[PDB]
Each structure stands twice: as C-alpha cells, then as structure tokens.
Amino acid sequence: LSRLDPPEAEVQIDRLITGRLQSLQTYVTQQLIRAAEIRASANLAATKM
Amino acid sequence: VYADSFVIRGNEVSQIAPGQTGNIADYNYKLPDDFTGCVIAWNSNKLDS
Known part of the structure; x- marks a missing residue:
C-alpha cells in the first residue's frame, strides 16, 4: 500500500487473502481430523475407565 | 447516467x-x-488549437 498503486495492487491483496484463507482452511481441516481422533481416544479411555 | 467533459493533451x-x-x-x-x-477521446486540433 506504499509502493504500488491502489487500483493495480488490488489483485495482489486479493491473491494474498485467498492464499491465507486456504492456509487457514487446511489448518481447520487438520484440526477437525485431530479433534475427531482425540474424541475417539477419549471415548475409548472413558470406556476403559 | 452522468457525463463529464474536459479538454486535455494527447x-x-x-x-x-x-x-x-x-x-x-x-x-x-x-x-x-x-x-x-x-x-471517449478524439483530436480537437481543428477547434482548440
């Protein structure tokens, strides 16, 4: 926002936002998978308890 | 619809x-x-020169 011009730097900001959104979505997916695994392990541990 | 008008260089x-x-x-x-x-732009040398 200091080097390039506003109208032509909008595509760069859009691409950065898309990349960060994808990098956060894959992290959310990994967290969901690990949370399901932890839930299964906790159910097994409660059954054993 | 809004129309603006002005005369500038080439x-x-x-x-x-x-x-x-x-x-x-x-x-x-x-x-x-x-x-x-x-x-829209065009030559105006016949009138503005």
Whole structure:
C-alpha cells in the first residue's frame, strides 16, 4: 500500500487473502481430523475407565 | 447516467483511469477505484488549437 498503486495492487491483496484463507482452511481441516481422533481416544479411555 | 467533459493533451489521456496518479489524476480529476463506464477521446486540433 506504499509502493504500488491502489487500483493495480488490488489483485495482489486479493491473491494474498485467498492464499491465507486456504492456509487457514487446511489448518481447520487438520484440526477437525485431530479433534475427531482425540474424541475417539477419549471415548475409548472413558470406556476403559 | 452522468457525463463529464474536459479538454486535455494527447498523451495526458492515459491518466484518465480509475486510481491513476499525476497532475490530472490527482489534482484536476480523480476517478474512484470502483469506477465503471467508458472513456471517449478524439483530436480537437481543428477547434482548440
């Protein structure tokens, strides 16, 4: 926002936002998978308890 | 529909675009970043010279 011009730097900001959104979505997916695994392990541990 | 009119140089018409910089694009006539429409220009040496 200091080097390039506003109208032509909008595509760069859009691409950065898309990349960060994808990098956060894959992290959310990994967290969901690990949370399901932890839930299964906790159910097994409660059954054993 | 809104129509604006002005007279500028030949190569100076390149500054007539959304978000440009220059003596005209910043101090005489600035277009918004989300501008939509058409820009029409032609020679006027037969009348304005």
